[PDB]
Each structure stands twice: as C-alpha cells, then as structure tokens.
Design a binder for these strands. Structure first.
Ligand code: HPA
Ligand code: HPA
Lengths: 338, 338
DNA sequence: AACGAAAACGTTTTCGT
DNA sequence: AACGAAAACGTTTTCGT
C-alpha cells in the first residue's frame, strides 16, 4: 500500500516514507503530490510493518489484577492519560491473581513485543516473582510493592505503613482508645502494610487490639459489610474503626446503618484510599488519601526513562499518603483528657 | 531469532514454525529438539512478524469515553474477560468526548491494525459519525446507541426508554404523584432515552413535571449533589425522585442527608444502572438494572462474528433493563387509593 | 514419510549520484 | 539539490522431492 501510494504519486516509496515521517527534505511539489495520493488512496500507514523494522511498538502493557475496583480503576485511567500523551498505546490485561492467567498475558505481551511493562499484581508469590524475572529483558515497573522485592525492576513505593500509622494516630488523638480494624488481604502491601502502620501507633499508645476486633477484608464492600457486623455484633464493641480501604468502608457504613447504629455518633469510622467519591459516602468519609494519579504518572515515567534513556539500573520512588478529614469521625472518650 | 532456533536444532525455520504452530506433522525427535532450543534460546515468537504475514493482529481496540466511572468500568472489565478467553489483546483508549482525541486514537488504532473496533463514545455528533465511517472497513460495533444511527456497524441496543418507563411506573404504583428527575446528558442515549421512558409513564398518568423539578446531571456524583439540593431547596418539593444514574444517585443521597432529610422517609429515590455496589449505598438503592456483562459479551460477539465469519451486513441486538427493589423507596400518598 | 528453499508481507534506511 | 534501488526486519507457506 505504501507502494500504491508511491505510484499514484510517481515517486519512490522511499520518498513517500520520507514525507510521511518528515525524515529528510522533500520538495513542496513532491510533498504535496504524496499527500494527495495519501489521501485519495485513503492510506493508513502500517504500524505493524513499521515496528517490524524500527524495533519498538510504541505500546505499553498493563498487567493488572482487575479493573472494576475504584482504587485500581482510578490508577488505570491515570496511566492511560499518560500513554496517550506521550504517544503510547495501552494494552490492559487483568490476571485476577491467577498464576496461569498471569503466565499467559505475560507471554502474550512479550510476543506482541510491548516496549515496557507496568505491573500491578497485588500478590507476589515466589512463583510469580519467578516468571516476572524471565522477562527482565522487557523493561518494567512494579506499581504496588512496599519495599523493593527485586533487582530486575523499577518500583514506585506508597508508604502504606506511614498511612496506617497516620490513621491510628488520628483516632488516638480524637479520644479513642477502643479501636477495631478490618484490614485488607495480608498478602498485599496495602493489606499488611497499612495494618502494621496502624498497629505501631497502637503499641505506641499502649492500646491493645482484642483479636475479636480485627477482621480480615478483601477490599470488596461485601467484606466490609460482614466485618462491621461481626464487630458491632458483640457484647463489648469499640468506638472507632479503622477500615483498610474505602470501598469496604462503604460496606462497613451500610451495616452500621442496618443495625441502626449511627456514624459517627455511635461508631467512628476511618478509611483509606480516598477514592474519587468517598466524599459522597454518607457520611462524607474521613480517610487517608493515596496519590493515585501520581502513582500512575510516576510509574509511566520511570518506564519511559528506562525505555528511552535505556536504563539498566533499578530504581524506586516513594510517594506519600495523607489524611483527609471529612465527617465520619467524632471525638472519643479521652479527647479532653490529654 | 526463529533462525536462531532453527540452527541450535539443526532443522529449518520452516520446521520450527511448523512445530510451534502444529501446522503439519513433525517427528517427535524433531519436535523435541525444537522445543529444546526454543527453550534454552529462551525464544519468544514475534507476533509482530507473524501478523505482518497472516494479516491480523488478534487484538481489539476499545475506543471509549472514560474508564473510572463505575458504569463504564464494569462494562470494560467484561469486554476484557471476553478478549482474554477468545485469545484477543485489548487496547483501551479514552477519548473523553473530544473529537481530536477521538480522531487520534481512531487512527492510532487503524495503524496498529486492530482486527475490530468496539465503540463507546457517549455522544455522537455528525462530525464523529463521519470519522467513524471512514473506518467502515475496520469491523466495528457501537455499544451505546439507542436506535441504529448508521448502516456501517453493529449495534447493541439497551432499551433505555423502557427502563425510564419502568422507573416512573414504579413510583406511580407506590403512591407517588409528585416526582422530580435529574436526567443525565441529553446528548447521550442513557441520558435522553431514560428520561423519555420516564416521561411517557408520567403523561400516561397525567402527572406533570414542574420544570423546576427537573435538573440536568452529568452522571457524576457531584451533579447529583447539586440537583437534589436544588430540588429539596424549594417551597414545594416532590416526594419522590427519579435519578438518571446510580452514581449521581449516590450524590443525591448525600445531600438529602446533609439537609437532614431522610431517605426514604422524607424523599424516595430511585436510580438507574444497578452498579456493582449500589446495594451498599445507604440506604440500599432501589434501581433499574442494566445488564452490563451481557452488554459486553454481546458486543464482543457480534464483532467476532463479523471478524471471523466475515460478515458484511449490519446487525443489532437488544438487551433488557429490569427493576431491582432495595430500600430507597417507600409508599407515596396515593398508594392506598388505587 | 518427513522435511527444505525461497518468496512474500509492508515498511525504513543506507548509499548512492 | 533532490531523490531512487535494494536490502533487511522476522515470520508463514507454497511447492517441491
Ligand atoms: O488490592 C486492592 N484492591 C482494591 N482496592 C485497594 N486499595 C488498596 N489496595 C487495594
Ligand atoms: O454516560 C454515562 N456515564 C456514566 N455512567 C453512565 N450510566 C449510563 N450512562 C452513563
């Protein structure tokens, strides 16, 4: 088809290619004539052919977990903005935490020859770290670890522990001493790490968390629902709760209401993530905000770098969570006494 | 690199290619030897080369509006499941309703030579219908129109009007006669069409909607927020409200609460979409459900068809909305009298 | 029986002059 | 000055025998 264009125009394909890519000077007349043809012939230059030669697809592949979850979804929309602006094409793939599913997309990706790879897998067992490393040659960044699990990749780090700590500290300073917590999955950073950040503040204050007050969640609203319930469904209940993710908080909130308990009036609740629409939770949710957009833009960037400036050394950038006060928390019993 | 494999194995690339694609019989011995090499050499067959020849990329491109919005996001996660299972690669692109942005991704897409194109643009002006048709040769389906706007594409249709109608009819039959409505954008099917489905039921019942009771939204929680407010912020207010989308409902709900009005006790509210987590709205939201997943799987399918069975004739499939009763609606003044 | 040799797919790019 | 001819990128596939 470039051949076809060359001929309607009566110049060499070499010519046509030069004008289409402004890669060498071409007389106006010639240049026009080309476009002329380019047009009527209705030509779409082939990226496949092109990549075949120049050696890069100008496309990036996101090997994610899932994409419906608010959290994830916001991150993804961000990464996409960035590919778009720097000319990349996004290939989105959800592995749902399945090794097989993962071994597959990974390979499909390599085969399609993505210029780099963004990794958001949530949980990383040895088996997965292992496949990951077989692709060390394709440049890549992990957007969701706490520390840097490997040497063959870039890492953007969230400081999830200091998020955890901030959350607890707020409750503490608000008068609270009987706190419960519904962490998310311990096999995830945003799961374990937020918890532990919360747990230090507790020890620090000599607050002890009765095991019957800690109930695992899985980031989904339903998990929050059941965990709330189980908490408030007992003789002795805390006055405040730290919930590992906004969406689950949202479920925690529904149950409180269902049991006719008032928030924050009967139970205070603090979440985490600061999802796009936690302000419209009822009540407006007080939570820890995760820089979602910078987590994304920051990831795209270390990758480009590696890609463009051909970097070989691993790198890591920290990002920082911060408290957003809204209306789901009220002073606790000890406020006045400090 | 296939050449490299051929040689470690001492067979022809032709051979290697036959075993890698099981496209002709190869002796075990030979077959093994190949894999052998395939392995140590650590070979990843090139899809780019391959597509270059066989003529198809085995990849589909989603030219969407945005992907953070619950609604959209759920649809997308669906389409992705389907590509994955039928071997396709997904290229996600958000045009945010911008013509330019649209003219771009469209072209980037063609150039990358996607096997087909899924279209979800929300609004379709002539200018966009126009670009769309310049790509009539790349097979495509529009997942969001009400009727079939063109002849050069497939259409999956939602019956949004009969969704609108169902919603109104519920309110009516619950005792309600003073209803307000916050529709979404009239330039969108899910905007206009839901409204009109609602508006017929009204006329049908001789209920009239005071213009001061209809306030445009844009599907975002904030728009619901402002529109609620404006409704309840006036001398005479309705007792029930029909809100064009769940997320905006969610915002409508927050404001009611903020003005200290009770739902459903003070105002009844019915939404639309049945987003994944409307059940955890507070109160659990009564709404019209949109088959999201079938809207997706149904789209992927007409496309495959066109792609695989090489279809030329346009086609359209209807899908059907349905009421989900939860807890945001209560009987109105006229319940007993019917 | 089981496999090779060689052209082609649609570009980009080196050297020409 | 302004442009062409021809090889190459990494596969698949037709005909061989
Ligand atoms: O794994 C996760 N899933 C969903 N939301 C989240 N927010 C933090 N981590 C997660
Ligand atoms: O355009 C839309 N955006 C978001 N949610 C929606 N639900 C129906 N239509 C829409």
């Amino acid at each position: 088809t470039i051949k076809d264009v060359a001929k309607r125009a009566n110049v060499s394909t070499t010519t046509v290619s030069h004008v289409i890519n402004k890669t060498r000077f071409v007389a106006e007349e010639t240049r026009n004539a080309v476009w002329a043809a380019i047009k009527e012939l209705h030509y779409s230059p082939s990226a496949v052919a092109r990549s075949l030669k120049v050696n890069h697809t100008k496309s990036i592949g996101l090997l994610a977990t899932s994409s419906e979850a608010a959290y994830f979804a916001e991150i993804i929309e961000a990464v996409e903005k960035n590919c778009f602006q720097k000319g990349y094409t996004l290939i989105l793939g959800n592995a749902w935490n399945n090794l097989e599913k993962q071994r597959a997309y990974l390979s499909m990706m390599a085969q399609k020859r993505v210029d780099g790879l963004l990794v958001m897998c949530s949980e990383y067992p040895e088996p997965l770290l292992a496949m990951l490393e077989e692709y060390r040659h394709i440049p890549m960044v992990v957007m969701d670890w706490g520390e840097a699990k490997a040497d063959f990749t870039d890492a953007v780090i969230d400081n999830a522990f200091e998020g955890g700590y901030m959350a607890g500290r707020y409750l503490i300073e608000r008068g609270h001493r009987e706190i419960g917590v519904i962490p998310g999955p311990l096999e995830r950073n945003t799961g374990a790490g937020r918890l532990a950040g919360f747990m230090k503040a507790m020890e620090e204050a000599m607050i002890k968390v009765p095991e019957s007050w800690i109930v695992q969640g899985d980031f989904e609203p339903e998990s929050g629902y059941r965990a709330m319930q189980q908490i408030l469904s007992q003789p002795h209940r805390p006055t405040a709760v730290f919930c590992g993710g906004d969406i689950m908080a949202m479920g925690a909130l529904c149950a409180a209401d269902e049991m006719g308990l008032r928030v924050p009036q009967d139970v205070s609740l603090i979440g985490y993530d600061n999802v796009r629409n936690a302000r419209y939770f009822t009540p407006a949710l007080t939570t820890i905000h995760q820089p979602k957009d910078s987590l994304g833009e920051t990831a795209f960037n270390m990758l480009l770098d590696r890609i463009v400036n051909k970097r070989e050394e691993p790198q890591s950038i920290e990002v920082h969570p911060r408290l957003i006060e809204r209306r789901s928390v009220a002073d606790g019993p000890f406020r006045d006494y400090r």
